[PDB]
Recover the amino acids of this structure.
């Protein structure tokens, strides 16, 4: 780690209506008092902002302002603006207009070099002793909007990622089941195809489930409702599946979800005449003109459901919950989630279109941890007593994700286990993101948990096979009489 | 005006024996197929052996050049040691009769289009491979369909009443969507025509679903499946939706790559400005691969595509209720009666013509029982030979005495459309037909709640028993 000081350097001048040369005695007096009083507020001892030099023009008052991480220059300059206005407006009869930036320099500690990228408002970048120096192309509007703080946070993220969070996974085992005998060793996806349970859909990593596979999905759903959601007092809601930029901005997904989303674009207009060229092209060529269509669709409005819970938060956005209403415990099972997974075909263990029950809870810190614990107890009961599967759980501070993993015997003794279930304590992230308050003024937390039916199927069928005679009695009772598939010649 | 359909072509293949060949061709060879001597004929002869042929409707000019491809290969093959490589076109012009001055259109393989005296003249950019693939045939057909539209084609949808329930007293008069918003049943989602359903509204949705399952799907022996929701061009081409569904689709584009370096510029832009760069994102996404679920049943048909069903397997009777349908609706602001994202149970059956018709009647019987006995709504049905759609309509009191009724349910007989489009055959060789019927939960809710209100005390006994105790919503300060 580099110990170099985080430092902000600002060279700027204030716009004046006329030339305030005579008011020099008052101007110099306020700057010295600012350095000992005003610019010190909100900073630890001797870490306040400093005006290092000052000079005058015939319509401008310039300064060089310096700061560390506290009372930053883009914050301190507006403090000096409001003081200089009141001190010179009443007696000296002179008005201060806008702020003009001449140079904005941030110095940030870093161990390694960074490849410079196209980032808005960053003029140039250069390596210096102990870190990185940024030159900013920023005016007063951008300073008021706190652009420098966002640029700093971005560079700090890039610095951390280049050195620290490089390990693919850091993994912490919490609980593991006693190993079981595994007499079934087929890839469940291949067995399901051979025995007429399902077929590949037209789209990438997409499946069509025949009656046999659908029955399995429905039984897992029934188990989650009856063994978890009902006894724990969860209430069904319907969350939207088309997710807008607004939602992902508030959830934080707009910070990097881009490589994995299926994007959605509305038509630019519903006017048939606008689309006639597309229809005509297809009727003549028997080909869909995708290049033309891309020109005729609007810019993306967002994408298809990715994490499932974010669009729910528009229901509580901007609202205050009464203390009587928490914990809010809800779930949704109203449709499909879409993710652009890695290249290479997979089985149902890794699809581009999946079906998940998303479980969401909101309350105080303690109510959220308690709710998480309730969920873990119910999941353990399900996996041990009903599905009777071999499994473990691992934790990827109480904020974070607990992952459930299970072995797939077709992958061999040294095969990688499959993540099939998770429980996430999200802290204040979502309440803060969507501006959801609690009546008592206590901090609101939330958690979520997603049951991916494909992953449960991949695990259960990999371990138990497709023959009901060899399934746990408790699972068999819930399935009922298996339906027949559609037989082909 | 009234012109005669005319084909005109100038091309070459890349002296005494060839001279008598074209005198015979205009009287013997290029005459067969024409009823009253309308066959193809050459007017300009040039020796690269250039031709200029003319034709009407029958014995078309593009077919005429391959007849001479046969004759010149025989009359010069062993005779003068000549072997033709191919044909290249210098000119192709079609003159089509038309009523009115027809709008300017961009169409593939059409170089230029213009209005003339009798109708429309149009030049083509076609080679030999293009006229082998019948491009001029498809261009002609398209333009004729537009000419008939400019002469007759007007905006109309058929209607013929079959059954209407006797008028009922309608004590509840609120727009159910407004009442629902007022009483905390639901809220608008971020997206256009999109709703988030609170526990009270979700309960209603799940009650209708329960009724359909228990009163209709189970007794009739329907088996649940899961149909894909992301629909590709392949599916819509086979289903016929690729002919004109474009104005209503929510298009889906994958990223051009998963490479995070490729997306860094987008993420960095957002982190600094707090504005997602939608213009840049559009350049970085691929061309659309299709769109979100529109009719719901088309993606199922990939399950049976190319297959032959044993006669023991029919009728095939399946349903799906695994997700959302998306549609870009016209007008502006609507309630839940007309949304861009809805939830439907799609019911599909496949069998012989007779079984498909039988299955439809079975469904009509169950819907009638549901709407009369359980929901107790005021409703009607109307037909829109055996192939077609039966629409169920219901009055919404808030719309007034003269209010237009709401379509809330349909049963469609699709004929052989889907088996043909997806190449599904029966073992016995008898024609497969199919039908489908979609239960829209939003629509059922708009009808039921506009007629019965939001207070469970005013709901029919049969509905209240299936609902159970209504959940409370989430209350805000
Ligand atoms: N591609 C997928 N196919 C099927 N189910 C999925 C997929 N991605 C996620 N899920 C389901 O959603 C749940 C929550 O999503 P999450 O983002 O935690 O998955 P993940 O951590 O990316 O798992 P993995 O890394 O194994 O894909 C998962 O536990 C899983 O059940
Ligand atoms: N905008 C909408 N909002 C809510 N529900 C809708 C909407 N559009 C359609 N539905 C539901 O879907 C059902 C069928 O719709 P439609 O008549 O368009 O047939 P389709 O099969 O979806 O389309 P197509 O006939 O092109 O195959 C309707 O009866 C209604 O229940
Ligand atoms: Cl999402
Ligand atoms: Cl569809
Ligand atoms: Mg994933
Ligand atoms: Mg996880
Ligand atoms: Zn979540
Ligand atoms: Zn349909």
């Amino acid at each position: 780690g580099s110990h170099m000081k985080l430092q902000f350097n600002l060279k700027a001048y204030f716009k004046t209506s006329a030339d305030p040369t005579p008011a020099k005695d008052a101007i110099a007096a306020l700057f010295e008092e600012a350095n000992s009083t005003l610019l010190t507020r909100g900073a630890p001892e001797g870490q306040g902002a400093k005006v290092t030099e000052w000079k005058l023009g015939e319509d401008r008052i310039e300064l060089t302002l310096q700061s560390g991480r506290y009372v930053r220059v883009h914050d301190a300059i507006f403090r000096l603006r409001k003081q200089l206005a009141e001190a010179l407006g009443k007696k000296y009869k002179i008005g201060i207009r806008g702020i003009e930036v001449e140079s904005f320099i941030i110095k940030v500690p870093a161990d390694h070099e960074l490849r410079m990228l196209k980032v808005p408002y960053i003029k140039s970048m250069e390596n210096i002793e102990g870190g990185i120096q940024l030159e900013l192309e920023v005016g007063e509007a951008e300073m008021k909007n706190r652009v420098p703080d966002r640029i700093l946070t971005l560079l700090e993220e890039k610095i951390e990622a280049a050195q620290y969070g490089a390990k693919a996974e850091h993994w912490n085992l919490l609980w593991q089941r006693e190993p079981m005998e595994h007499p079934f060793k087929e890839d469940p996806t291949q067995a399901m195809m051979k025995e007429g349970w399902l077929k590949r859909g037209s789209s990438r990593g997409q499946w069509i489930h025949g009656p046999q596979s659908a029955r399995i999905f429905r039984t897992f759903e029934k188990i989650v409702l009856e063994e978890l959601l009902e006894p724990l007092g969860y209430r069904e809601m319907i969350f939207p599946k088309l997710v807008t930029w607004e939602v992902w901005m508030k959830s934080g997904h707009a910070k990097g979800v881009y490589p994995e989303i299926y994007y959605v674009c509305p038509p630019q207009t519903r006017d048939p005449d606008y689309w006639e060229e597309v229809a005509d092209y297809y009727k003549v060529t028997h080909e869909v003109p995708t290049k033309l269509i891309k020109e005729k669709i609007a810019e993306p409005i967002g994408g298809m459901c990715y994490a499932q819970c974010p669009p729910f938060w528009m229901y509580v956005a901007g609202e205050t919950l009464p203390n009587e209403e928490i914990p809010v415990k809800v779930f949704d099972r109203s449709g499909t989630s879409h993710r652009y997974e890695s290249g290479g075909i997979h089985g149902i263990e890794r699809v581009d279109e999946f079906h998940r029950i998303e479980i969401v809870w909101i309350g105080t810190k303690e109510e959220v941890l308690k709710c998480a614990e309730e969920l873990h107890d119910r999941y353990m009961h399900i996996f041990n007593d009903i599905l009777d599967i071999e499994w473990r759980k691992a934790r990827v501070n109480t904020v974070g994700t607990t992952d459930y993993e299970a072995c797939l015997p077709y992958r061999g003794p040294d095969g990688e286990w499959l993540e099939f279930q998770n429980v996430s304590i999200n802290g204040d992230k979502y309440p803060k993101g969507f501006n959801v308050k609690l009546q008592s003024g206590d901090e609101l937390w939330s958690g979520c948990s997603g049951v991916g039916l494909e992953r449960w199927a991949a695990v259960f069928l990999a371990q138990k096979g497709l023959d009901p005679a060899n399934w746990p009695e408790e699972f068999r009772n819930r399935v009922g009489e298996m339906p027949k598939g559609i037989r082909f010649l």
Observations:
- DSSP finds 13 helices and 22 strands in chain B.
- The first helix of chain B runs from residue 16 to 25.
- Residues 106 and 113 of chain B are 8 Å apart (CA to CA).
- Chain B has two domains: 1-153, 154-477.
